[PDB]
Amino acid sequence: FNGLTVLPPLLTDEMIAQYTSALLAGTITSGWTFGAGPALQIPFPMQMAYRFNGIGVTQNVLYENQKLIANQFNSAIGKIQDSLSSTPSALGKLQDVV
Amino acid sequence: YRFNGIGVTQNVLYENQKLIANQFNSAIGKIQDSLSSTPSALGKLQDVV
Amino acid sequence: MSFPQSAPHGVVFLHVTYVPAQEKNFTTAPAICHDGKAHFPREGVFVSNGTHWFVTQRNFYEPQIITTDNTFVSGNCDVVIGIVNNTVYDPLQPELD
Amino acid sequence: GTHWFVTQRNFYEPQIITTDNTFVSGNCDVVIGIVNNTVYDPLQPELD
Amino acid sequence: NQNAQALNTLVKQLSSNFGAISSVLNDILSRLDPPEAEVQIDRLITGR
Amino acid sequence: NNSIAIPTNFTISVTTEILPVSMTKTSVDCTMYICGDSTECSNLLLQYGSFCTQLNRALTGIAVEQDKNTQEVFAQVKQIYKTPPIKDFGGFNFSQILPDPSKPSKRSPIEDLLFNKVTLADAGFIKQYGDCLGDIAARDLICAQK
Amino acid sequence: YQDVNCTEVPVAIHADQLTPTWRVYSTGSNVFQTRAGCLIGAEHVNNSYECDIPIGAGICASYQTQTNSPRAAASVASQSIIAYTMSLGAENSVAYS
């Protein structure tokens, strides 16, 4: 009651999540090649073959280690999800704004 | 070079020489028209001063 | 490339970019297993036109003839995923044998 | 002189115009200021 | 230079009155009484 | 899991992006603003220390930074090169991004619009109404708004 | 003297501050009309630099131990290269080919 009001966002937390979903699905179905111009189809194995060729690791190595990379990736993502769950403190940088 | 440099073969420059020029030449036309029609963007200049 | 333009107390850039306009779908293979040696293209991927396989990069369709000189050997049939059994033509033996 | 060389834009380093150091595409009628000259093949005389 | 000048400028602002007729916080405390002291203090606090 | 989309056509597009670089070397004389010619005001002003001097110094320093922000963007190449005397860009046809010397200022058809569609309001470029002293010409007539 | 012409350059015009018309002088001398006012104590020279001490509106001065530069008359045949409109470097010849 001290002349304190709040303005609603235009692009809402949910709309932001929808945009995120679009971005997630883009990187997965079309690589980066949706960020400009019509989306190109490219499956995920082939998106890695180019992501790797681009740092100077061949396609053969990607495949040779297919199963390893997948396990490493899956685990990293696991640990991330799990860290957020274990302690809220990881998001301090957001809590600090609030 | 500029073509190869973005991962598109120089072959395109040549095969599509007409296509490429036309598009650029025209884009310059459109820019002049855009700026006259929507000089709204020049607000980024005007407001600062 | 870009070209600069002046404006009072500012700069306006004209950025020349290549943006795709029309895509078309092709069937691919990352490699061909020629005789147990897997052949990858020097650049690009193998594409089928429904009959013949060619090498082309993902940014433009340029069906290049598949020949050993435009590939390199790395791995074998059992290393590479999505690999297809096909011929990589030797460009040298036809003029000697 | 009268010889042609492949060189980079960042340093003059003449290299010979062979069918190996070059590749073929298109035709001569879509390249503006196309020059007609001889491209060398190190292999061809060994095929006789 | 700015570190030092900022600190030096801060010290020099001690000489300000900001509408008071004394800058010397100690003499105001010790020599003046409320009818005058409060007046100068209200003005030095806001100013400072 | 076995197919990709490969471009069969493309467009070469030109994107126009407008950015600011600097502002005019604006200055306020704190003393003139507050006291003008008032001797007794100055006496009372000195009581606020160098607070007022700092205000003047800060605006002077900004003015200095504004010349540099402009150099930083445009003085990057201090050598003056002239336009292509020859326009044989092969398939391309442009001069319309280049200065037209026949114009009052060596501005391109595009810069003509970037200038005439930008009106800036600045004191000293805007002259007084009623004038005080000096010719309306040039910057011969003094202007300091009110 | 910010934003005035070089005909009414006095500190006080037909008045004083109980001190000589300028400040201790009653004349300025070395009066150069600039695009930021009128510069007194410096004269225009036809020998330019890529600036030293900027004044504004393409106007600059330089002091290079010239045994007074913004406190002397102009010369273009001796080192009294004082105030000038700045040059944007030199031209560097190139032609499209």
Which residues pair with residue F5 across a beta bridge? C25
Q: Is E13 exposed, middle or buried (0-12, 13-18, 19+ CB in 10 A)?
A: middle
Round to whole Å and give the CA distance between C22 and B39: 31
Round to whole Å and give the CA distance between B19 and B17: 6
The region that residue F36 occupies, defined by phi over 0 for left and psi between -120 and 50 for alpha, beta otherwise, is left
> Scanning the structure block, which residue is given the tokens 């600090």?
A96
| Residues C86, C34 contacting (CB under 8 angstroms) | yes
Pairing of strands C10-29, C45-48: antiparallel
Round to whole Å and give the CA distance between F27 and G36: 13
Would you state the structure tokens that stand for residue G54, as one six-digit string?
A: 């900027």
Would you state the structure tokens that stand for residue E42, as one six-digit string?
A: 């209200």
Contacts for D47 with CB less than 8 Å, ≥ 6 apart: C95, C96
Nearest to C82 by CA among A63, D45, F130, F78: A63
**Chains that contact D by 3+ CB pairs under 8 Å?**
B, C, F
Alpha-carbon torsion, ordered A52, A54, A57, A62, to 10 deg: 20
Report CB contact under 8 Å: F5, C23.
yes
Long-range interactions of B6-13: CB distance < 8 A, separation 24+: B6/C18, B6/C59, B7/C57, B7/C59, B8/C18, B8/C59, B8/C60, B8/F10, B9/C57, B9/C60, B9/C62, B9/D25, B11/C62, B11/D25, B11/D26, B12/C60, B12/F10
Identity of the amino acid at F40: E
Q: Is A9 exposed, middle or buried (0-12, 13-18, 19+ CB in 10 A)?
A: exposed
Report CB contact under 8 Å: A60, C21.
no
Round to whole Å and give the CA distance between C71 and C36: 14
**Helix-helix angle B17-37:F109-116, to 10 degrees:** 20
| Residues G46, G14 contacting (CB under 8 angstroms) | no
Nearest to F142 by CA among F1, F17, F32: F32
Helix ranges restricted to H, F75-124: 109-116
3-class secondary structure, C64: strand
Angle at C92 between CA C88 and CA C96, to 5 degrees: 130
> Scanning the structure block, which residue is given the tokens 């199963």?
A67
Q: Which helix (H) or strand (E) holds C85?
A: strand C84-85
CB atoms within 10 A of CB C19: 13
Handedness of CA C68, C73, C76, C82 (dihedral sign): negative
| Residues F51, F45 contacting (CB under 8 angstroms) | no
Round to whole Å and give the CA distance between F10 and A33: 13
Nearest to C18 by CA among F7, A22, A48: F7
Q: Interface of chain G against chain F, CB under 8 Å?
A: 3-5, 7-8, 13, 35-37, 50, 54, 56, 88-92, 94-97
**Count of alpha carbons within 13 angstroms of residue C35, beta-carbon side:** 4
Choose the closest CB to F1 out of A39, A40, A43.
A43
Report CB contact under 8 Å: C59, B6.
yes
Pairing of strands C32-33, C84-85: parallel
3-class secondary structure, B35: helix
Pairing of strands C32-33, C37-41: antiparallel
3-class secondary structure, F41: helix
Q: Contacts of residue D43 in chain C, CB cutoff 8 Å? A: 92
Report CB contact under 8 Å: A64, C79.
yes
Cα distance from F7 to chain A (closest Cα, Å)?
8
Q: Contacts of residue B17 in chain D, CB cutoff 8 Å? A: 30, 32
